[PDB]
Amino acid sequence: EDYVEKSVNSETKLHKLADFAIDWAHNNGLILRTKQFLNKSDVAEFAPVSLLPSPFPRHAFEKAVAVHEALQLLYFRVACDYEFMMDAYKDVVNTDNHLRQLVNIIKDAHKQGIKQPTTLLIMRADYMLNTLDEYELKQVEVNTGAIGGLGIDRRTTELHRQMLRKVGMDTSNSPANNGDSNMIESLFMAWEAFGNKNALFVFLSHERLQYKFELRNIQCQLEELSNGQMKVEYVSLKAGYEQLKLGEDYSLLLNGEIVGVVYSTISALGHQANAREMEARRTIELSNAIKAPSLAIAISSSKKIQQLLTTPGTLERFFPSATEADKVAAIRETFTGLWGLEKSDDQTERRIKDAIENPANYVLKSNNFYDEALAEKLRTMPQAERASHILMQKLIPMATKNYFLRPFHEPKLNVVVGELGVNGTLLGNLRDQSVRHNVQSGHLLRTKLREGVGDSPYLF
Amino acid sequence: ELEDYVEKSVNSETKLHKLADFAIDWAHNNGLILRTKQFLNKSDVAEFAPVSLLPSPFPRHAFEKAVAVHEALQLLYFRVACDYEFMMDAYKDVVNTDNHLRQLVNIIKDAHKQGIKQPTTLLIMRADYMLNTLEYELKQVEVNTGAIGGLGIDRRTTELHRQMLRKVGMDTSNSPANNGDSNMIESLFMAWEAFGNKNALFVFLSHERLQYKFELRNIQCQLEELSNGQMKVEYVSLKAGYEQLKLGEDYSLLLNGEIVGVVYSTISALGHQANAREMEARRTIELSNAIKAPSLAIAISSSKKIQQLLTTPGTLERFFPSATEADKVAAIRETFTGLWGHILMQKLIPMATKNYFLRPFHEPKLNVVVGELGVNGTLLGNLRDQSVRHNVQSGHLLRTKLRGVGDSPYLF
Ligand SMILES: Nc1ncnc2c1ncn2[C@@H]1O[C@H](COP(=O)(O)OP(=O)(O)O)[C@@H](O)[C@H]1O
Ligand SMILES: Nc1ncnc2c1ncn2[C@@H]1O[C@H](COP(=O)(O)OP(=O)(O)O)[C@@H](O)[C@H]1O
Ligand SMILES: [Mg+2]
Ligand SMILES: [Mg+2]
Ligand SMILES: [Mg+2]
Ligand SMILES: [Mg+2]
Ligand SMILES: [Mg+2]
């Protein structure tokens, strides 16, 4: 399919469609704070997006959506398996102080005993298409720890349905995208589970952020759902050092008030936190607040754990019963090759040799090098760094054409590639590993120049 | 009274910023926005519409009076617009000193000589009132008929103010419903159907550089929804209209060769000082069979001179001759203050209150302020026989200045 080129047949049509889309974005809240004023909402720009929804195979979309609940159950169980988590991090700990401080928080939480059984896992699974013209769906990453912008994603779908109508195309191949509703319902469900209507709901978030309008949408809808009863607050880890305390009953206290939910948009793995920020993370973690997500759930989505999960028998540790072989198989077929660099087997040294000699087949990742950069990193890597890196099979994605809409850039025709993101939530119990609500809801396309922007799939 | 609840409800700089911060984010999330001053030709960035932090106190009696009289006020000005002899007489002297008004009246003269080609027209009116101090009486300051918009801004302002009221623990039932934007759209769609050709364009006669572009886009999307994707919309200015608008040999209005069924003006006939090319576009529009929202005669019926003439004894009774319509005449007349034949007007002394202004990049503070109540509506009429298909009041606003910004009433 190259319907985008077929549907946009002049510069006059390009500007008429772009102009409409930009105004639509502002009118429907598909917006971010400007880079110039990340601390201020006085002005806002539209979220960067494709002009039309990028073609995506229907089979691959259906596969990715279908496996998500089982994928969420997997990572929930991984997070709950203390012995597995400590073993996966035993080497990485010695070379990386950020990950050491985080694992020590989890160690301290485990030895004090868990004070709050209810937790909310929030996951995005990312996939690319890999070429065989037929394509297989393969998983690139899993993200737990800080998931947001689901309102941006829905609005992007809605925009694309409008754009499809404008160029005379059927909108039934644009799938429904209501993740933001699940986010809010799940967050509200978590707030009720705390069992104290005077307990605060806290957005653990940066002061300077593009996504502030998105968080405000969650706030308004949470307040509506609680009939004005839920008090909401915003705090960063920097400010949390002074403002968050652990009460003598293990309550989380924000300026002395009980907090019932901490919804993190500050990634535990992604955000390089200083010593004051880690002490706030610790305080949160040792408290009886429902965490969305808990630290153990946040750090379960590292590249090392992604790699370990591909080793035979490892998936079966979390799904031991023959009744769950269908989940194991469905997850396994979305994996491509991943390998660790830690040990001195002959299997690993041959893998390293293969990648040095044939680097176009690989991507080298830390907790990203390509081609001769990859071969050189492998040649010159110190003994210590081996454990903080994994080898992954290189995926060759489907290429299409599309226009990008970005603040203050003329749109033009680019060759582009998509990355499919599938979102969901799981509300669970850490003590007995039961599940109250495990759903897939919401998706996106992230589209880049091949040689990026928000996008949504048009299924074929 | 509830006359300084704003001061009572906002008792620190900390509370002021927490409320302001919430309101600004709410505005962007709900489309209470305008294009930036820096980039009036571009929608890439947008700022929030300037508004009061809380809804300004306004007497319930005065609001109810202004809303109640509106349909009769609309009927009055419709009938004024349709009375060619009255309009020419009101402008006979003014014409000789003012070239802008001369060109406009000459368009109406040329339309009258050719015979009017489209009987259906849509009057869009805002009546402005100030409170006058004695207790307060409601008095009319102005009537506006040639370019009315921003009713979506007004509704959203009401919605914002209901949110702010909840945040400071105040009852929202004294904030009246404000759904003028829906009437605007329904009335505009009604006008488009009355043309009787689903392939006919709907045209926003509008500036290219304007803060209100997002508002017009909202109307576009809702008109397209209401037509089930059938209505084609376009935008054109009078500058661009010189070359792009033509009068067809059957009196069709042609925008780049396509038939136009409705011309909705947001370029004021009295307010916008138009050049010679722009007046020829205005003429083309006016001589065509497009339904005009509003027609030029309706737009120029709302001059200060006509406002003044309407206060002279027996002049209201020209348009409402029957004893049966003396109740309308009396209800309209009690909202008039003194006017005499520019023109002399009696000075009104408005009610003062306190409020905070939210404006892009300026810290809010407590100001002494005065309000001006705007009441909106539409009338879909027939110029040939003077009949009326739809005459409703819908929508209002407060415009609040330092003794400005968008505001909404909190009734007491
Ligand atoms: N196996 C792979 N083959 C090809 N490209 C990849 C592969 N893995 C990652 N990439 C590219 O690199 C990008 C970033 O790396 P990723 O591992 O997803 O980490 P993160 O999203 O946390 O930065 C991906 O979005 C994708 O475009
Ligand atoms: N009779 C009056 N007494 C006091 N102020 C007036 C009077 N008439 C007009 N004003 C003030 O002048 C402003 C603008 O005048 P107006 O006649 O409404 O023209 P326009 O709104 O078309 O510019 C009003 O908003 C009001 O503040
Ligand atoms: Mg990624
Ligand atoms: Mg990850
Ligand atoms: Mg099964
Ligand atoms: Mg005025
Ligand atoms: Mg006037």
Author numbering:
A (entry chain A): 29 to 160, 167 to 401, 408 to 491, 502 to 510
B (entry chain C): 27 to 160, 168 to 374, 429 to 490, 502 to 510
List sentences from the manuscript.
Glutathione, the tri-peptide γ-L-glutamyl-cysteinyl-glycine, is the main low molecular weight thiol antioxidant in both plant and animal cells, often present at millimolar concentrations in vivo. It is synthesised in a two-step, ATP-dependent, process: glutamate-cysteine ligase (GCL) catalyses the formation of γ-glutamylcysteine (γ-EC) from glutamate and cysteine, followed by the addition of glycine by glutathione synthetase (GS) to form glutathione. Cyst nematodes have exploited a series of gene gain events to redeploy glutathione synthetase-like enzymes during parasitism, within the syncytial feeding cell formed in the host root. The most recent expansion has been coupled with a diversification of structure and biochemical function that has given rise to enzymes that are introduced into the host cell, and likely possess novel substrate specificities.
Remarkably, each stage of the evolutionary process that gave rise to GS-like effectors has witnessed at least a 10-fold reduction in apparent glutathione synthetic rate, such that Clade 3 GS-like proteins have not retained canonical enzyme activity. In contrast, none of the Clade 3 GS-like effectors accepted any of the tested terminal amino acid substrates in combination with the γ-EC backbone. Comparison between Gpa-GSS22-open and–closed reveals a functioning ATP grasp fold. Residues in the ATP binding pocket of St-GSS1 are highly conserved in sequence and position in the Gpa-GSS22 structure (13/15 residues), and similarly conserved in sequence across G. pallida Clade 3 (structure guided alignment, ~12/15, n = 24). In contrast, there is considerably more variation in the di-peptide binding pocket of G. pallida GS-like effectors, yet, this variation is not evenly distributed around the pocket. However, the glutamate of the di-peptide is exclusively coordinated by interactions with charged side chains of residues in the binding pocket (R, E, 2xQ, N, and Y). Variability in the glutamate portion of the di-peptide binding pocket is ubiquitous in G. pallida Clade 3 GS: of the 24 GS-like effectors there are 21 different amino acid compositions in these 6 positions, not one of which is canonical.
